[PDB]
Amino acid sequence: KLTVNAKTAVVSENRSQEGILYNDPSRYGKSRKNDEDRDRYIESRLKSSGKLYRIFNEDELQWFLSEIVKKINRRNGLVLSDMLSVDDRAFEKAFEKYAELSYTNRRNKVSGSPAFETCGVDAATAERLKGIISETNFINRIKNNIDNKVSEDIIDRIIAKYLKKSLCRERVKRGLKKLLMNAFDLPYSDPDIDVQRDFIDYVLEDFYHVRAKSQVSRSIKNMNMPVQPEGDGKFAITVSKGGTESGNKRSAEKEAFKKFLSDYASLDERVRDDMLRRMRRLVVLYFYGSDDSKLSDVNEKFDVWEDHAARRVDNREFIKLPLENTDKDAERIRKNTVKELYRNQNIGCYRQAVKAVEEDNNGRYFDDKMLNMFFIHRIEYGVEKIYANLKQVTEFKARTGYLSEKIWKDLINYISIKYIAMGKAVYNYAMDELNASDKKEIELGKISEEYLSGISSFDYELIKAEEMLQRETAVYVAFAARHLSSQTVELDSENSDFLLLKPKGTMDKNDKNKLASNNILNFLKDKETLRDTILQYFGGHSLWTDFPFDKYLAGGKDDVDFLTDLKDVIYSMRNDSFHYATNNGKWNKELISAMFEHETERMTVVMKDKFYSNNLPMFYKNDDLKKLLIDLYKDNVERASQVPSFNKVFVRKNFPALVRDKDNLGIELDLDKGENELKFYNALYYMFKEIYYNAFLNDKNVRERFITKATKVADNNYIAENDFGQRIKNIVQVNPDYTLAQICQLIMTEYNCMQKKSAHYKMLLLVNLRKAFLEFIKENYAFVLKPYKHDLCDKADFVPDFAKYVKPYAGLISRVAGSSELQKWYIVSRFLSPAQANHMLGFLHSYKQYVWDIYRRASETGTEINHSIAEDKIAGVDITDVDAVIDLSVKLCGTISSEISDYFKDDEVYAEYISSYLDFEYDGGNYKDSLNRFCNSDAVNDQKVALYYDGEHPKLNRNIILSKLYGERRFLEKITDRVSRSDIVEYYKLKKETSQYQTKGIFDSEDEQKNIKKFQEMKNIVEFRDLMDYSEIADELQGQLINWIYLRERDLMNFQLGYHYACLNNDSNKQATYVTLDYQGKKNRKINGAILYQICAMYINGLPLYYVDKDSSEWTVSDGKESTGAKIGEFYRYAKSFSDCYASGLEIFENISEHDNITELRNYIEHFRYYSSFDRSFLGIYSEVFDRFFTYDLKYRKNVPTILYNILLQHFVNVRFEFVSGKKMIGIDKKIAKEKECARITIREKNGVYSEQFTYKLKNGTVYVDARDKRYLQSIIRLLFYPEKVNMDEMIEV
RNA sequence: AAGAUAGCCCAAGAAAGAGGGCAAUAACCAGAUAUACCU
């Protein structure tokens, strides 16, 4: 990259913007480059590569081609830096002047190569310089290192494979081939091509970068944001300042489209229909000529959407494809030929359309010629986007109808993203009065004072940070509501949203004698066990025997109101904007606050018990752990993001060998010898993790040793350490108070494809952190160096007083009691799985770091930025408190009670639940006796099964309990096979085989590593850990779907805001209540810019909406807490005061005919209907999202399959997609729903799924093992395809 | 309907042009909750 070690930004002074270059990290006064230093930096970076300039970049035939290009690039070859620097570089200025004049001659009409006499050189020396850059000298320099004969095919393959990108032009490539054919004395004819002018002269222009030298710096200075305020304080799409002849034409075309956006925002549907028809005629003219039948009658009001559907099925060919010869180097030649055919036809289409719009308009197109030229340029650009990086030559992509309809949707896409861009600026910077206030009259759509002078790039970075966390939080709100409802209510198709159920006292609106249809009482599964079921998600009801529920549930209140209170906490976070505050809890704040305090009082005992459960005291004295437990948990630690994880710094497989090494630690434990050796390394690994995060990363002495140990080579892979150390040295000079975490963040930022990639600084950060940790252990925690195995005491006897030593939640208890917002973060995070709560905590860390980095870079560049987004607060509450709250949920969600009665009624109900995942041979009588008969039956030889029993009761399995609370059991039954006897037989066999060499880490033979891997996979199966992996994968696939839901809902609101903002500010006819609302009720209020307020009120929980009620037929105002569906219905009731205002302009956003299908798809996902019906596959849901969920922005739609690919590859599953046809419905029966073809994303039937391979290093060499066995891949396929069945033996490749 | 693996902004541009930027925009990178995700 050109500006490799610089950053760009857009700053605004007074409605004047400037793109700037700045160094990062740097200080104010040494970061932002002035106009002169910007120019010199670009020119310096451009000419810092002249030395290694080569015209060529980088099987028997493929390797002969590699030898030719290297011999040409070696010394005495075609090395321009040596040819042009001849005679002590006395002619370098004349050669560069020649290159600049050659480029100027191309622009300014003058034909012919420039004469060196005009370059400051006499006529005698001029004839010498001409010879140096002559065809003769180029031929001699190319043949100087070549002793082989080459053919025309070799020249063609070399040009197509290795030619420099900037030289890959039609006439340049033809000039190079003509020279290469003349060099090797091959007959060739191309008289239209001049080798000197078409190739050699251009190479000189490219060698001296005459184009970039006079354009890159200026193009950077003219960069800007999508939307900026104009003179009258109005937001509009940014128009370039121009400055050149083509720049003034381009800006005038952009001004014509800006008026189009204003004119198109009209409530009169006939106006928009006429404007789209004129745009449609431009597309028809471009691809079918002015003689097309749809252009004959100027006044013909033809249906633009039938023309769109008709051309798509036309068989006309845009270009004719040549025959294919797989010879991959020959196919690269064919694709290059096809691209030039596209370009030639695209140019022909452009010139004929430009001519016809100037000579034969007459009402066919737009009256503004600049608007016609803007669209024609968009069409030509749209064609180039399709073929410029053509993936694979296909026939359908060469059809004229395919391209014309892709461009048609491309034009509408451009209109869509511009309205959304306008709404984004309006929502964030012109809706200030949405914040709660006592003002009886408010004005929406007026830009705030701080942004009347323009928007900077740093401003939009803050928006992204806030919108990312908002969307990520919305995913977990849905999951929290799902987990709470999973065991408490049973929903149907008419009441599928748990958060929308009504309190127990809700009666019908037309008959006050009957309960409301959405009354929560109509859906409770077991009212008598409601409290104990709810308390399962709070650690088990046995932990709340001393909690005074009757105090907070007094009078008529019972456990139904308890469920309703928790339901209300979660719902209050749905659609809860972080940017606009509407912190008053509807629920019982005292009950939720008391439950939080009750859970904090067990935090110290839980963290103490984790030392006990990890067998840590089994090898260490009891006062050394107590001094450690105090050191680690005395204060709540807020972790920073972008810091390498403990599991990546200390790989678990290399952990035993690393600790035994006497240069590192040299820990020596001598002793069921293999049993306790594994217990010790598992104990030591957990202890080092807790020390790593809660003491090591924040230790002052650690930061100082790290800086010196990492900057050692800087004061002396060797190339990396001196550059790595110099950047650490620079970071400390910029700010000596940067923490160790901030040094890692700044280093890891420079270390950083849309697609996850399958099989310098990051490795050095892991090394320096690993070494610094081992030295931290020896100095501060030397007791770990001398373990001693002994029998452990009882859990109650292990540091019983630890609760009184440390009280880290002392201050947080009181602040949670008086904060409704903190109680939201508590309940929502508490009802998540441990993995999801950890992910939520990670998202909060990324938010704080992102905001911190934005202000750091804005300050170093001297860019004034409004601090509406606090570094230490989110939604008016401290981030440190939110962090400690979610961190409490993370630890407690993973703390399963030791009482079976907390989750099941008795041992029989529990044993029957285990039968869904374990086939312990159920005879038909009781499940407990069948499970006890199975656990005490012989497995192999003299070792029986056991595993699932503990004395007189079945063993409490942590993974089974977690899958009941946070998993989906009927989903797990359909995609997994139950654990059978043959599985347990193979488990003990592999454990006995590997018992000799289980605790080494780096094994001897290749067969030992493959048996350890097979055993670890069998252990995960027998302990139900394969179940938890599939649940996480399903949660990640479902979470991404819910993420996309709130991505679209944000942009739908932005589109409506920007569209109606443009309508408010044009001369189109608008009525009174559209512009101003004068509500005269009890809660009277006057709303200026009423349409903008009412749009935002639809999407913000707590924002009231003004409307005419359906039953009273009178004006009213809601409390703002009603559902989105109810608010949309209220908007329609408001719109009747001034033909579909809600859907106005949405033909740009989506297909109106499918609007109800999008809502049904949205509800299907967010209401978790897949886990009740199983009527569609995950691939089927992702297919429909790709087909029609992101109609409004191509950049979101065209990345949907890649995102699905990345989620699977993250779990080491590689899939090969195939895009075929499915079915979808258009409309919902009321009875109009018709079926239509739909995009279907599927996996290739033959070798479409394969596992990533692990690189396992041994003593001598390396063994490659599949990361995922066939059994694992089969469940992944079933997860993606169910209910559809496929041939998984044929699909999986091994 | 779709046959994806980007999109936009600045520059250039009709004997076309094709050079830059984007944490601005999604993705990407990174994140360790529970105890046998490598390189």
* Three-class HEC string of A85-133: CHHHHCCHHHHHHHHHHHHHHHHCCCCCCCCHHHHCCCHHHHHHHHHHC
Å: A600 CA to B37 C1' = 33
**Burial classification of residue A1275, based on how many CB atoms lie within 10 Å of its CB (0-12 exposed, 13-18 middle, 19 or more buried):** buried
Distant-in-sequence contacts of A965-968, Cβ < 8 A, 24+ apart: A965/A483, A965/A486, A965/A487, A965/A536, A965/A537, A965/A833, A965/A903, A966/A483, A966/A832, A966/A833, A966/A836, A966/A893, A966/A1031, A967/A1027, A967/A1028, A967/A1031, A968/A1031, A968/A1034, A968/A1171
Q: Which residues contact A919 (CB under 8 A, 6 or more apart)?
A: A978, A979, A980, A981
Task: Tally Cβ neighbours within 10 Å of residue A984.
Answer: 25
Nucleotide nearest to A1203 (CA to C1'): B27
Bases of strand B lying below 7 A from some protein CB = 1-39
The alpha carbon of residue A985 and the mean position of all alpha carbons in its chain are separated, in whole angstroms, by 43
Nearest to A531 by CA among A505, A557, A556, A502: A557
| Method of elucidation | X-ray
Kindly state the tokens that stand for A957.
């399995």
Å: A109 CA to B15 C1' = 9
| Alpha-carbon torsion, ordered A103, A109, A113, A115, to 10 deg | -90
Task: Tally Cβ neighbours within 10 Å of residue A301.
Answer: 10
Question: What is the C-alpha to C-alpha distance for residues A734 and A26, in angstroms, rounded to an integer?
Answer: 6
Nucleotide nearest to A693 (CA to C1'): B32
Question: What is the C-alpha to C-alpha distance for residues A1096 and A553, in angstroms, rounded to an integer?
Answer: 37
Nearest to A282 by CA among A369, A367, A372, A355: A372
Å: A216 CA to B18 C1' = 14
Å: A463 CA to B5 C1' = 27
Whether the ω angle into residue A954 lies within 30 degrees of 0, i.e. cis, is: no
Task: Tally Cβ neighbours within 10 Å of residue A992.
Answer: 13
Nearest to A1178 by CA among A879, A975, A900, A901: A975
Residue A1263: phi and psi, rounded to 5, are -115, 140
Nucleotide nearest to A757 (CA to C1'): B28
A1280, A1292 contact by CB (below 8 A)? no
A7-12 and A1262-1266 beta bridge pairing: unpaired
Nucleotide nearest to A640 (CA to C1'): B31
Question: What is the C-alpha to C-alpha distance for residues A931 and A934, in angstroms, rounded to an integer?
Answer: 5
Q: Which residues are registered as beta bridge partners of A407? A: none
Nucleotide nearest to A378 (CA to C1'): B8
List, in sequence order, the alpha helices (H) in A265-327: 269-288, 304-312
DSSP tag of A317: B
A473, A455 contact by CB (below 8 A)? no
Å: A542 CA to B32 C1' = 29
Question: What is the C-alpha to C-alpha distance for residues A702 and A799, in angstroms, rounded to an integer?
Answer: 29
Q: Which residues contact A14 (CB under 8 A, 6 or more apart)?
A: A453, A454
**Burial classification of residue A440, based on how many CB atoms lie within 10 Å of its CB (0-12 exposed, 13-18 middle, 19 or more buried):** exposed
A441-443 and A1085-1088 beta bridge pairing: parallel
Nearest to A539 by CA among A894, A54, A946: A894
Å: A647 CA to B39 C1' = 15
Å: A642 CA to B31 C1' = 7
A83, A141 contact by CB (below 8 A)? yes
Nearest to A1023 by CA among A961, A938, A934: A961
Task: Tally Cβ neighbours within 10 Å of residue A40.
Answer: 12
Task: Tally Cβ neighbours within 10 Å of residue A1263.
Answer: 17
Nucleotide nearest to A1262 (CA to C1'): B39
Nucleotide nearest to A460 (CA to C1'): B24
Question: What is the C-alpha to C-alpha distance for residues A279 and A382, in angstroms, rounded to an integer?
Answer: 14
Q: Which residues contact A1013 (CB under 8 A, 6 or more apart)?
A: A1254, A1256, A1265
Å: A1223 CA to B12 C1' = 45
Nucleotide nearest to A21 (CA to C1'): B21
Q: Which residues contact A277 (CB under 8 A, 6 or more apart)?
A: A301, A302, A304
| Alpha-carbon torsion, ordered A433, A435, A439, A440, to 10 deg | 80
Question: What is the C-alpha to C-alpha distance for residues A1241 and A285, in angstroms, rounded to an integer?
Answer: 34
Å: A1077 CA to B26 C1' = 37
For chain A, give every domain's residue range: 60-217, 227-427, 616-669+676-752+760-791, 900-955+967-999+1011-1023, 1180-1291
Q: Which residue is nearest to nucleotide B37 (CA to C1')?
A: A1211
Nearest to A805 by CA among A607, A954, A974, A547: A607
A688, A646 contact by CB (below 8 A)? yes
The helix or strand, by DSSP H or E, that contains position A921, with its residue range, turns out to be none
Nucleotide nearest to A1217 (CA to C1'): B4
Å: A58 CA to B16 C1' = 30
Residue A1155: phi and psi, rounded to 5, are -60, -45
Q: Which residues contact A883 (CB under 8 A, 6 or more apart)?
A: A636, A638, A639, A841, A844, A845
Å: A969 CA to B22 C1' = 44
Q: Which residues contact A553 (CB under 8 A, 6 or more apart)?
A: A559, A561, A562, A591
Q: Which residue is nearest to nucleotide B36 (CA to C1')?
A: A1016
Residue count of chain A = 1294
A1178, A1169 contact by CB (below 8 A)? no
Beta strands in A963-1114 (DSSP E): 1076-1079, 1085-1088, 1106-1108
Kindly state the tokens that stand for A638.
């807020």
DSSP-derived 3-state class of residue A1216: coil
Nucleotide nearest to A849 (CA to C1'): B23
Question: What is the C-alpha to C-alpha distance for residues A241 and A1218, in angstroms, rounded to an integer?
Answer: 46
Å: A376 CA to B22 C1' = 26
Q: Which residue is nearest to nucleotide B33 (CA to C1')?
A: A834
Nucleotide nearest to A1219 (CA to C1'): B3
Å: A42 CA to B25 C1' = 26
Q: Which residue is nearest to nucleotide B39 (CA to C1')?
A: A1255
DSSP-derived 3-state class of residue A211: helix
Burial A333-343 (b: 16+ CB within 10 A, else e): bbbbebbebbb
Strand order in the sheet with A1076-1079: A441-443, A1085-1088, A1076-1079
Å: A332 CA to B14 C1' = 28
Nearest to A452 by CA among A8, A16, A1059: A16
